[PDB]
């Protein structure tokens, strides 16, 4: 599986003029390019070292969209405030998210796209990528404004064709690192609580495909009583961490065993302590 | 009625839609050197053919301190119901139109696509 | 309220040739009919420089380029072998943001008409 997910965020500032507009493009689980009109560079910039040798031709053509996207979004942040009859001195957020996915065959698997006004989904491009759907009972306008002026067709274009193509153009450029499956460095840490109870925490360290699934199971079938789990967290260099914990009767901890289900590993590894 | 080559012709007007991104200041001069003015609007239907368009275009409209108000290239009145937020635009900043009706008051030293306009004999 | 005498009223003039701008959702078949009911043809692409223009006017449109079956060469109205790059059961082409694409001839898209 591979994805070229982009993420757009616009925040209206009454006291300034222009609203804050931020973009980030994601190959699988690497942010490689960003955009910010607040920096000393109101152009599209690279994050991932494997975009560094890309020339002007490309950047100008992507800044062209970013900049334009902010202007179109400025207007929505005003158009939307009308629909909702909202006070003009309020801060508001309009977010746009779109993504294309490849599969086993390595060609288009599925697509998606949706908008959202202040934490509440606003619009959403249907599974069939041909007609827009109104989420909020006040979105119907923006639905029928877009359904009528054939915009879905242009997204059906980007998703099934443009997005698809560039994923493949990006992966060939970051081949040696994006496709480099990293196995998690697994160990168990012991921590006591009192004399009758203690916590066994199963560690996962530095794995590049982000999707993982840690489990606690006792000598066989495996119960999930008094278990604990955390949000898969980013390293800071472009790997991932996650730990899984459980409250265990002090003395006989071997009764409980840990399993790691990861994409990069050949074997779902067993852990004992 | 007839136009120039890279120019588009509607209702005996020659329009020049822009390829490039330039200054408000610069664009005015650039229309002038091709013997046209920076786009002064009549109404919503004067750019109807460009309905869909998603770019934003510089227009021949500023705020000077003769009239403490927004006036065009010629110096005519701004139709106070063409642009709805006419009492919101930052005087320091310039306007930028888009054939969906919407306007954006914006930094004049900034770089945008733009329209020039010709007319009769 | 006077327009150009070489073209109809609500029409635009680019390069010696008039255009009709769509704003209507119709099918390739009908799109070809409607244009021919207006004494003109369906939108044909001449140069890769008309193409940039035509996207800043109105971005989606049926073009006078079609296949017969899935596997035949792409042909203009003239019956001539079409000489521009054009990208299973799709047989009529469309213009979309400065590239030519293959589309379901039953899709309800926007049509533009073209003259001489």
């Amino acid at each position: 599986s591979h994805s070229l997910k982009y993420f757009h965020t616009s925040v209206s500032r009454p006291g300034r003029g222009e609203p804050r507009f931020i973009s980030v493009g994601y190959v699988d689980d690497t942010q490689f390019v960003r955009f910010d009109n607040d920096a000393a560079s109101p152009r599209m910039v690279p994050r991932a070292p494997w975009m560094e040798q890309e020339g002007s031709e490309y950047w100008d053509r992507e800044t062209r969209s970013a900049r334009d996207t902010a202007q179109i979004f400025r207007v929505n942040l005003r158009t939307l405030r009308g629909y909702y009859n909202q006070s003009e001195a309020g801060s508001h957020t309009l977010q746009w998210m779109h993504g294309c996915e490849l599969g086993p065959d390595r060609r288009f698997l599925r697509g998606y796209e949706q908008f959202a006004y202040d934490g509440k989904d606003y619009l959403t491009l249907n599974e069939d990528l041909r007609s827009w759907t109104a989420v909020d009972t006040a979105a119907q306008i923006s639905e029928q404004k877009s359904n009528d002026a054939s915009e879905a067709e242009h997204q059906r274009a980007y998703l099934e064709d443009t997005c698809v193509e560039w994923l493949h153009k990006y992966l060939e450029k970051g081949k040696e690192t994006l496709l480099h499956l990293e196995p998690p460095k697994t160990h168990v840490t012991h921590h006591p609580i009192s004399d009758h109870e203690a916590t066994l925490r199963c560690w996962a360290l530095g794995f590049y495909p982000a999707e993982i699934t840690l489990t606690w199971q006792q000598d066989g079938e495996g119960h999930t009583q008094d278990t604990e789990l955390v949000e898969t967290r980013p390293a800071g260099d472009g790997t991932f961490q996650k730990w899984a914990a459980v409250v265990v009767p002090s003395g006989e901890e071997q009764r409980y065993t840990c399993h790691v289900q990861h994409e990069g590993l050949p074997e779902p590894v067993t852990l004992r302590w | 009625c007839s136009c120039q080559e890279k120019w588009v012709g509607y209702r005996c007007n020659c329009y020049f839609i822009s390829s490039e991104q330039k200054t408000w200041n610069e664009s005015r001069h650039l229309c002038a050197s091709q013997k046209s003015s920076l786009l002064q609007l009549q109404n919503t239907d004067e750019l109807d053919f460009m309905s869909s368009s998603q770019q934003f275009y510089w227009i021949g409209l500023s705020y000077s301190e003769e009239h403490t108000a927004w006036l065009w290239e010629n110096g005519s009145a701004l139709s106070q119901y063409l642009f709805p937020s006419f009492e919101t635009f930052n005087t320091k900043n310039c306007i930028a139109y888009n054939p969906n009706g919407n306007a954006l008051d914006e930094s004049c030293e900034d770089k945008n696509r733009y329209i020039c306009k010709q007319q009769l004999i | 309220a006077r327009h150009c005498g070489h073209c109809p009223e609500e029409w635009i003039t680019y390069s010696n040739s008039c255009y009709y701008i769509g704003k209507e959702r119709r099918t390739w078949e009908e799109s070809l009919l409607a244009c021919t009911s207006k004494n003109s043809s369906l939108l044909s692409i001449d140069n890769e420089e008309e193409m940039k223009f035509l996207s800043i006017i109105s971005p989606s449109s049926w073009i006078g380029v079609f296949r017969n079956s899935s596997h035949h060469p792409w042909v203009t109205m003239n019956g001539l072998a079409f000489k521009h790059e054009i990208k299973a059961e799709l047989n009529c082409a469309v213009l979309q943001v400065n590239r030519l694409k293959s589309a379901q001839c039953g899709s309800s898209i926007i049509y533009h008409c073209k003259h001489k």
Partner: peptide, 9 residues
């Protein structure tokens, strides 16, 4: 590359 075109809500 990002989508060449958005929606006017």
């Amino acid at each position: 590359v990002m989508a060449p075109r958005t929606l006017f809500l």
